[PDB]
Structure formats: structure tokens, C-alpha cells
Design an enzyme around this catalytic site. Structure first.
Site, PDB file in Angstrom:
ATOM      1  N   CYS A  91       0.858  -1.172   0.000  1.00 43.64           N
ATOM      2  CA  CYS A  91       0.000   0.000   0.000  1.00 43.64           C
ATOM      3  C   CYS A  91       0.906   1.237   0.000  1.00 43.64           C
ATOM      4  CB  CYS A  91      -0.899  -0.005   1.230  1.00 43.64           C
ATOM      5  SG  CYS A  91      -1.963   1.473   1.312  1.00 43.64           S
ATOM      6  N   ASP A 237      -9.738   8.031  -4.870  1.00 45.75           N
ATOM      7  CA  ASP A 237      -8.516   8.240  -4.103  1.00 45.75           C
ATOM      8  C   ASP A 237      -8.403   9.734  -3.805  1.00 45.75           C
ATOM      9  OD1 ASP A 237      -5.932   8.120  -2.934  1.00 45.75           O
ATOM     10  OD2 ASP A 237      -5.236   6.636  -4.385  1.00 45.75           O
ATOM     11  N   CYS A 241      -2.560   8.981  -6.083  1.00 44.69           N
ATOM     12  CA  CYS A 241      -2.499   7.518  -6.287  1.00 44.69           C
ATOM     13  C   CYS A 241      -1.125   7.068  -6.800  1.00 44.69           C
ATOM     14  CB  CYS A 241      -3.611   7.047  -7.221  1.00 44.69           C
ATOM     15  SG  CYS A 241      -3.718   5.276  -7.383  1.00 44.69           S
ATOM     16  N   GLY A 242      -0.369   6.412  -5.936  1.00 46.63           N
ATOM     17  CA  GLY A 242       0.970   5.981  -6.308  1.00 46.63           C
ATOM     18  C   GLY A 242       0.989   5.055  -7.522  1.00 46.63           C
ATOM     19  N   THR A 243       0.199   3.985  -7.481  1.00 44.14           N
ATOM     20  CA  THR A 243       0.175   3.037  -8.588  1.00 44.14           C
ATOM     21  C   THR A 243      -0.391   3.685  -9.860  1.00 44.14           C
ATOM     22  OG1 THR A 243      -1.916   2.147  -7.777  1.00 44.14           O
ATOM     23  CG2 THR A 243       0.137   1.024  -7.110  1.00 44.14           C
TER      24      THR A 243
END
Ligand SMILES: [Cl-]
EC number: 5.1.1.8
Lengths: 315, 311
Positions: A91, A237, A241-243
């Protein structure tokens, strides 16, 4: 409060997206590896997940982070991430939260560290100013310029790309990208998700596209990059959002629009922002995501045995 | 900045009671104090009740000294958009919080709000009873066409907020159906607005109540209530239950003194009763609250959302 189970937690947010770090009062999960602990949590202590992450103490956006002694000696802590429906592996925003929480507690200092999860160990860096950089999993673009007809809207074009989750990334939206438009953006992205499913459009090996990203601009005429991201639970989010940002970098890299090492600033729906960069790696990229987190509360969760929702509200 | 708070829920709907750390609002009446909070300290409202610390469902309850010396406390209620006057579920939360802190004991008490003092009673078993404002039906048998559902009929009633109350449900009344129920009730709201159907004096009908039964075959009364910000009430809704009592009364379906048991969408329940009052009824609502956390909110000056996330 003498009659109540107590759980010590520190709450933070990472560019708007909350993490609840659990420090004490949680049942022991045993001496296995972190994946064995995650299964013990799921099988024998699932009511604790809901007590911490579901309403009324938590929410549909809350990720819990249970700290455990690391089994990987190169790591400063083990962690199991969880939310109001189940258990996670890695995460990104939660890892940034964990790092900042440990730092504010005096447990780590600036520099390189590693965080162990049930599905492997993640490299992170803590800067003197509190910025946390994390290494995202390898990301790449699966298909470019995919078109889907979205009922109530029209034709929508986008890329399909992996950033550690499968994303459909479009530049098209029916309104400005701001918090005031979240309900409209949520409905629109949900319609895209359904239309993709109906059309049989998937990632590699039939992977379900369960994250939808609008890659647009801030509505202040600055031309600054801003996104909106719909997550699997139909919740947006709050962060960039990293991904999802990693998946965007993969597309920029594939189109030759962002160079290795070059910084990319990505706002999310709230106008908070992450920094992204990458090195070329195999058929795709190795992305690095940087963001900030701030502690919002220190709490003792209290579980009253007479409370009908003591262990959380669950359908 | 540090803010000491105790979080609770009343039948599922959360209250955050503020105990210490909040700026002094001065020496005027409570309504003056609320106006000073609004004008000069509004960032504190958002810090406490908006994301990331708060939510769409969260009501904050600021304790302050009462101006009515017969009251055990004064309170100002607020949420992620603005300021309230009275707040039923929030008052139940405040009472139980004061009791758990040992500041009051079972018995009758009074809670001063900016718009009047509310009589409450705390039972030995922790049940809190509160007086709701006078409630009455404004219009019977109002009807709107709702795309996908045909004609939806209901009463327009005042319980301290304007409600359209319909017995028509598109599906079972359970948490698993909340998205569907939210869509349906939002459509009802929009259709009332489109038609120009209002409460008295053009009052916007911004609460929508489905008055139905539990989906478990028990036959128990259960509602679903859409609140103004399009979040559903997790509780049976004090003002919405009071508005329902007013309609039952007007139709002669509920006698003065007769108890009415009302589940909300989660299956938790309030008890209601009434006595007659002018054009309407004087409702009394009872329910339970439980403490869920003791917390120090921490506000980092470097945090872009230090004072909350705001549209
Ligand atoms: Cl393939």
C-alpha cells in the site's frame, strides 16, 4: 472507560488519503512470517479489522496499518495493511504514512529504510524535510488508444497500463477535476469501468481493469497535471495515487514524453501532489513516487462490549 | 494545536465531543458564540469535522459554559458544511459522554444549544431521551414522477427539518442496498425540486425518508433517510422519526403516549412517543450511544490540510 478494550493508534494522511497506524493493544498474531500472520488475522481476528477500519471508527477510505516486528532484518518494521473489506499486500500511501509515523515517534531518522509487508519488502527514503520516496513495482503500458462507448456519455479513449494495479487512463472528463465534482466524476468513471468489462477490454492475461484514472489538468488554467482515480470499492482516491501515477509515468515514458530521471508533478483531485520519476527497466519502467504525510490524531480506540457495533458496522 | 475529543456513535451515527483545546468564543449568548465561531474560527470547524479527521456523517459538538445556569453544559453542533442548532443524535452522544466522564449521573438534565435549552433524561441503563421540537404535517399525499419508478407518493412534514416521507421502497431496506436506496431518494429529491414542491414558505425539502419494514420478515418498522449532503443517516434519524410520528398522529394511527419503535437502515433503533402541541405534536425520542474513541486531534502547521479538506 475501564470496561473497554483499548487500541492505540496514530492517524495520518498522505496527500489527503488516510492511514491508521496501530501501535498497541492488538492481539498477538504468532511467530510465523507476515503472510502467515495476515492469514491468522483474517481467520481468527477479523472482527478487529472491522473495529479499526469500518464505520463508525473508520470509513470506506481508511487503510489500517498494523505494525509487527520485522522478520526481514533489513527492515525497520513489518506491516499488515487492511481496510473496511479485507486485507492488502502493499500500500503506497499507507507506507508513506507508516514512515512518517515512525519518524515522528523518534523510531527512525532521515535516510534509507525498508518496510516489510506480507508480499515482500519495499525500499523507501525519508528526507530531512519529511518527504518520503517509495519504489513502486515495475509498470508498463499494455495497450494505447483503446476506445469504449460509455452509455450516457459517448466515446472515451484511453491507455491500459499496469502500475501495480490495472488502470484505464483517459484524458477526457465531462466536468472540471475538483472535489466539488467528485460525485459526477465517480458516476462517469464507474460507467467507464462497466463499459470496459462489457466490451471485454482487459489487461494482460485477462486482468480486470478495476481502477479508472482521468489524467487531466487543474481547473485553474495553470495547465498543471491533475488526476481523478476511482478505486475498486467505488471510492475515489483522495491522493494522486501511487500506482496510478506510476501507470501514468509508464505511458509518458512509452510515448517519449518524459525522460529517465526527469521529475513529473502529479496533483490528485484535492490539488495535493506527488512527484514521480523512473528508470527504464525491462519492457517498462521502475518508478519512484515521492509524497508527504502529516499526523492528524493520536487516539485510543475504545471497544465497549455493550455496543452493538463494538466491532464495526458490517453488512 | 491539540484538541481533546471523545468520539461516540448514536445508533450508528457519529458524534465528536470537543472537551479542550478550542479557542474562546467570548461571553455573549450561545447564538452570538456560534456566529463568532462562524465568522472568526471556521477553520476549526473544518479541522474537526471535515476529512481527513472527519467525514460526511460526522457531527461535532463543542462544549462550552452554559448561559442558562440550569443547564449542565452549553453546546454548539456543527458538521463538514456548516453550523447546526439542535441535534438529536448529537445530544444523545453528548449526554452519554458526560456520563462516562462522570460529570452527570442518571436522571433529568438540560443541554443548552444556541436555539434553546433541550430537556433530556439519562436512564440507569444508559438510554437517553430527548425532547424534539414541535413537529407537524404540512402536506398529505404529495406525489412526483421518478424516472424508473413511476409515481411516488408521500407526506411533507416538519420534524426540525423538512422531510418527504414515502412508504414506497424499490428494494429491501438494508445496508447492502444503500447505493440503490441513495439513488432512488436522490431522484425523489430532484423531482420535488423540479416540480417546485416545498415545505411552508418555500422551504427546500432536503431530507428524504423511506418509511418501511425490516427485510428479515420480522415486520418491524425500519426507515432509510437521505440527508442533505446525500449521505444516508446511519441512525433512525431523530427529526425524521419525529416527522413520522407527526403523520401517524394526524392520521390517527398513533395515540398520545403510545410508543413507536423505529429501526434505521442498520437495524439499530429509536423509540418515539408524543403528546399534542398546537398544530402538531411534542415528540420525545430515545436511543443509545456508545463511546468509540478518546483522541487528541493534532494540527501540523506544515500540513496543507491542517484545517481540513474543503471544496
Ligand atoms: Cl495478453
Amino acid at each position: 472507560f475501564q470496561s473497554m478494550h483499548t487500541i492505540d493508534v496514530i492517524d495520518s494522511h498522505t496527500a489527503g488519503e488516510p492511514t491508521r497506524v496501530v501501535l498497541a493493544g492488538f492481539p498477538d498474531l504468532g511467530d510465523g512470517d507476515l503472510a502467515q500472520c495476515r492469514e491468522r488475522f483474517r481467520s481468527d481476528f477479523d472482527h478487529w479489522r472491522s473495529a479499526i477500519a469500518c464505520e463508525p471508527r473508520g470509513s470506506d477510505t481508511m487503510v489500517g496499518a498494523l505494525l509487527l516486528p520485522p522478520r526481514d532484518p533489513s527492515a525497520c518494521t513489518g506491516v499488515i495493511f487492511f481496510n473496511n473489506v479485507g486485507y492488502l499486500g502493499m500500500c503506497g500511501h499507507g507506507t508513506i504514512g507508516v514512515v512518517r509515523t515512525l519518524a515522528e515517534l523518534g523510531r527512525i531518522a532521515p535516510g534509507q529504510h525498508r518496510i516489510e509487508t506480507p508480499v515482500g519488502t519495499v525500499g523507501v527514503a525519508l528526507a530531512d524535510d519529511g518527504t518520503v520516496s517509495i519504489d513502486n513495482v515495475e509498470s508498463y503500458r499494455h495497450a494505447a488508444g483503446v476506445e469504449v462507448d460509455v452509455p450516457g456519455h459517448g466515446r472515451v479513449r484511453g491507455d491500459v497500463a499496469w502500475g501495480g494495479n490495472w488502470f484505464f487512463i483517459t484524458e477526457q472528463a465531462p466536468c472540471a477535476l475538483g472535489l466539488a465534482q467528485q460525485r459526477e466524476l465517480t458516476a462517469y468513471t464507474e460507467a467507464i469501468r462497466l463499459a470496459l468489462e462489457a466490451a471485454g477490454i482487459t489487461g494482460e492475461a485477462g486482468g480486470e481493469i478495476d481502477h479508472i484514472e482521468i489524467s487531466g489538468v487543474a481547473p485553474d488554467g495553470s495547465g498543471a497535471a491533475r488526476n481523478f482515480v476511482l478505486c475498486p470499492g467505488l471510492a475515489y482516491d483522495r491522493s494522486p495515487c501511487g500506482t496510478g501515477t506510476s501507470a501514468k509515468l509508464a505511458c509518458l515514458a512509452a510515448d517519449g514524453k518524459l525522460a529517465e530521471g526527469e521529475r513529473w508533478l502529479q496533483q490528485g483531485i484535492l490539488g495535493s501532489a506527488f512527484e514521480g520519476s523512473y528508470r527504464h527497466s525491462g519492457r517498462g519502467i521502475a518508478p519512484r513516487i515521492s509524497g508527504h504525510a502529516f499526523i492528524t490524531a493520536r487516539s485510543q480506540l475504545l471497544i465497549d462490549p455493550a455496543d452493538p457495533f463494538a466491532w464495526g458496522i458490517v453488512a
